[PDB]
């Protein structure tokens, strides 16, 4: 359909979930304002800096072939054939969804096409037997269930209920969480699984099942962004009080809680620790639907955000520099993925063609055997746009993963401030969050909400 066609000596692939899944409706419709265009423009912003960096691939002019997956594994694989028409895709940077990334990885493995995923926490891509050409910067779902299991132990939450999202992300998270919960003496109640495409009436069924064990006031949530909002919407209707322990799917984005914002007051969400990019903030803010002709989806993005139309002579007045800008918490991973092979290509260029800073006729046929195997090795380099007084470094382990750095978020309802996400701790191989910042954990608030199956009995 619509794809980016940036040109250069060698082009670089991409796969972003621009649109939302339509289910029984059309394949995918409305765009994503935080995990879509914001991540889509992050790659272009990173590519522009590399193309103008004298110390990173001089005279190479990296291209872009960003496709569209829009949160559909079948749709992602259907258009993934464009990445393999030549076999010239030297690499693919995409797979924001675990289900999407798994399907693309299998196809690209046959043609030896290295792939980097900026957001894929499933604890199965680390298996090199099945995916030997896969690398990523985000940690797997291994040092993520322990963080949530320890939080439950920290609050002495023993009897809990788990909600799983059908696919290759929720099921993997539940299995990792289940074994950690058993090893930490955490009781497990009935577990309910939600399908990828289910009616809104079915979403009321699972919340009813969670209400059928009333000593389970704590619900552990393993769902994608499009599956957690429906449960929250199903919580206002048939009103119930359930505190939420959220996975990476919930995140700190202010769209899964918008609307049904009263049913997740005591919700704890764990995201991936990162820092905002000051340079990217100016790039995204200083954008217009007319000047920015590189992105075919920018015109559609200007319809949902800054509500207007391009037919009745509307728009052309709103500017992104006026309204506040909320940067996605995973923009750092997107710009790190682009720079991951940018230095690797420079390292490959320095060794394969040590004659001039151009193509030496030997790197024209790109092979995954020599590239990825030399790419999974030490590509240790300073993180781009790193803030001051920090020692962050981009590197890959033997499994092609990143370091296990996490953070803890809670949902606030402060007066004269509507609602706001506040960071209350991090996970540096151990819990460090404080108790005085959580509204329901404050000493001057009453007993904390707990979920024990049998009130303990004294001697």
């Amino acid at each position: 359909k619509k794809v980016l066609t940036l040109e250069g000596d060698l082009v670089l692939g991409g796969l972003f979930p621009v649109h939302q899944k339509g289910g029984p409706a059309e394949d995918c419709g409305p765009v994503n304002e935080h995990r879509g265009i914001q991540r889509l423009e992050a790659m272009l912003f990173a590519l522009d800096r590399i193309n103008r960096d004298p110390h990173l691939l001089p005279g190479v002019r990296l291209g872009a072939h960003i496709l569209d997956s829009c949160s559909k594994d079948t749709h992602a694989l259907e258009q993934a054939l464009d990445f393999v028409r030549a076999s010239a895709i030297t690499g693919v940077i995409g797979g924001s969804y675990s289900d999407v990334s798994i399907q693309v990885a299998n196809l690209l493995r046959l043609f030896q096409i290295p792939q980097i995923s900026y957001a894929s926490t499933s604890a199965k891509l680390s298996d090199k037997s099945r995916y030997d050409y896969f690398a990523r910067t985000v940690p797997p779902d291994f040092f993520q269930a322990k963080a949530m299991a320890e939080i439950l132990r920290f609050f002495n939450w023993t009897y809990v209920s788990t909600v799983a999202s059908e696919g290759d992300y929720g099921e993997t998270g539940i299995e990792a969480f289940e074994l950690e919960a058993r090893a930490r003496n955490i009781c497990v109640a009935t577990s309910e699984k939600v399908g990828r495409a289910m009616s809104r009436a079915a979403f009321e069924g699972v919340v009813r099942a969670l209400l059928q064990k009333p000593s389970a006031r704590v619900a552990v949530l393993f769902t994608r962004s499009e599956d957690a909002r429906e449960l929250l919407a199903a919580s206002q209707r048939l009103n119930a009080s359930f505190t939420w322990v959220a996975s990476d799917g919930w995140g700190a984005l202010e769209s899964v809680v918008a609307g049904s914002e009263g049913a997740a007051e005591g919700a704890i969400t764990i995201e991936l620790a990162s820092y905002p990019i000051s340079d990217f903030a100016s790039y995204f803010q200083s954008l217009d639907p007319w000047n920015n002709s590189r992105n075919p989806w920018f015109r559609e993005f200007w319809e949902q955000r800054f509500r207007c139309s391009f037919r009745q002579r509307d728009c052309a007045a709103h500017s992104l520099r006026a309204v506040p800008f909320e940067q996605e918490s995973k923009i750092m991973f997107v710009v790190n993925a682009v720079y991951a092979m940018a230095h690797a290509l420079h390292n490959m260029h320095r060794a394969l063609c040590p004659n001039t800073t151009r193509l030496c006729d030997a790197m024209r046929p790109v092979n995954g055997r020599r590239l990825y195997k030399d790419f999974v090795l030490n590509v240790k380099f300073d993180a781009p746009f790193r803030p001051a007084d920090t020692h962050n470094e981009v590197r890959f382990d033997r499994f092609g993963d990143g370091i296990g750095r996490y953070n803890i978020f809670t949902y606030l309802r402060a007066g004269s401030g509507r609602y706001r996400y506040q960071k209350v701790g991090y996970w540096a191989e151990g819990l460090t969050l404080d108790t005085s910042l959580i509204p329901w954990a404050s000493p001057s608030a009453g007993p904390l909400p707990a979920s024990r199956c049998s009130e303990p009995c004294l001697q």
Binding site: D73, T74, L77, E78, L81, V84, R85, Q103, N106, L107, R109, L110, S129, R130, E175, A197
Partner: protein, 441 residues
């Protein structure tokens, strides 16, 4: 390695003549029952459609059968040959493996090649939205889950434990069984056992420890592959638990010598479920007739000759299959005979409509379209070689009709019931696996 036959149109096929290999090796020990016994069945079926003139007259059918060593990863690399030109086969026969067939169904739909499987019973594979071109000739495992609940209820079983293997079959098998178990509310699951894809030697020993931990869970239900049932059964002998556990087997443990070979001590008193089948006489006088220097098309037939007969030196060519005392005409050999027949009948119907009067392959349908052929497959209605009616549905599944087999000693499987619509089990087995014995009035 390929066994391609030259023909006007070629038919893809995936058969697991080998097994999963440990360590870095992607292939393991040669599988006699799965694979080779079904490999020549399609070849025999392909050699019978090309003989009679009532089906596809003056049209010879080729083949592009490949090797899948019971490995999901290895199955995708081989399947690239089917769509190498379209980056030409008209149809591809799906592999027995549930997880293997899934990875072939999500890539063949991109290039629009219909797929017909014979031994994959994944409830997931019934989703039309994700698997457009996948067709099945066997009932799904979701019907087996209801059947097992009916069987255990008739046996008054109350406390059972479930064992599942890693993949899309074991995980989707017990999950369907557990959900249907809660619907009736009569039986409950003691615990769930997960078998890793590549575990250690002592991992299987730990599996029986958890089963023995709940000593009152006398009956255990296993959803495992062909090579996993034997290993778990062997661990029971080394733990001195011969007769303590009664095994509840799925369609992966039908009438098969291999899971009960040299293990007829723990396998006793085990009841299993297999779909409708019959002993075809045509294939009885075909496998026993093929010998060395005759079936030179099958490369792996030489390996089959070495492994089966030697079971060493002096490999003389003076032995026959009939005297091996190991040929049993495996149950799922029938399901691949009519699988190609259903696809062949669809091609015959397509040939008549798109080529009126032209006996040969008319140029109007030379670039065969998978989408056009897909609707023909859904409307195939004929009788198989044994006599069973072959009919598909809107999702490409098959009607649920099974048989109940119980392993007896006299070492031969005997029919003890059926699951036509509700149940037909007739009383053997012994009443056990009942926790919370009556505590008197």
């Amino acid at each position: 390695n390929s066994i391609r036959i030259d023909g006007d149109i070629t038919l893809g096929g995936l058969f697991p003549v080998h097994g999963r290999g440990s360590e870095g090796k992607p292939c393991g020990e040669l599988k006699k029952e799965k694979g080779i016994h079904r490999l020549e069945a399609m070849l025999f079926a392909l050699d019978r459609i090309n003989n009679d003139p009532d089906l596809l007259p003056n049209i010879t059918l080729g083949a592009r059968i490949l090797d899948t060593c019971s490995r999901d990863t290895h199955a995708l690399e081989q399947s690239l040959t089917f769509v190498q030109a379209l980056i030409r086969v008209v149809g591809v026969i799906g592999a027995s493996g549930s997880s293997v067939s899934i990875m072939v169904a999500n890539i063949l739909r991109l290039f629009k090649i219909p797929q017909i499987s014979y031994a994959s019973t994944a409830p997931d594979l019934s989703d039309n939205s994700r698997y457009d071109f996948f067709s099945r000739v066997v009932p799904s495992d979701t019907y087996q889950a209801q059947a097992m609940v009916d069987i255990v209820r008739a046996l008054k079983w109350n406390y059972v434990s479930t064992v599942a293997s890693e993949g899309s079959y074991g995980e989707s098998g017990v999950e369907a069984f557990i959900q249907k178990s809660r619907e009736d509310g009569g039986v409950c699951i003691a615990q769930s056992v997960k078998i890793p894809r590549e575990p250690k030697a002592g991992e299987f020993d730990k599996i029986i420890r958890r089963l023995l931990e709940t000593s009152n869970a006398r009956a255990v239900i296993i959803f495992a592959n062909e090579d996993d049932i034997r290993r778990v059964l062997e661990a029971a002998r080394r733990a001195n638990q011969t007769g303590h556990f009664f095994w509840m087997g799925s369609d992966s443990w039908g009438s098969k010598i291999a899971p009960v070979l040299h293990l007829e001590e723990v396998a006793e008193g085990a009841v299993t479920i297999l779909p409708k089948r019959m002993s075809v006489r045509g294939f009885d006088r075909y496998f026993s007739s093929r010998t060395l220097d005759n079936n030179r098309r099958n490369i792996w037939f030489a390996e089959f000759w070495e492994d089966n007969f030697h079971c060493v030196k002096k490999c003389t060519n003076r032995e026959r299959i009939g005297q091996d005392s190991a040929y049993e005409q495996e149950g799922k050999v029938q399901f691949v005979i009519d699988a190609v027949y259903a696809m062949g009948h669809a091609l015959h119907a397509m040939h008549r409509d798109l080529c009126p009067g032209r006996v040969g392959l008319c140029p109007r349908m030379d670039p065969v379209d998978g989408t056009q052929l897909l609707k023909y497959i859904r409307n195939v209605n004929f009788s198989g070689i044994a006599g069973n009616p072959v009919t598909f549905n809107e999702n490409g599944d098959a009607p649920g009709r099974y048989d109940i087999y119980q392993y007896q000693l006299r070492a031969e499987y005997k029919v003890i019931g059926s699951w036509t619509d509700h149940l037909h089990l007739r009383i053997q087995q012994l009443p056990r696996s009942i926790c919370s014995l009556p505590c008197q009035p």
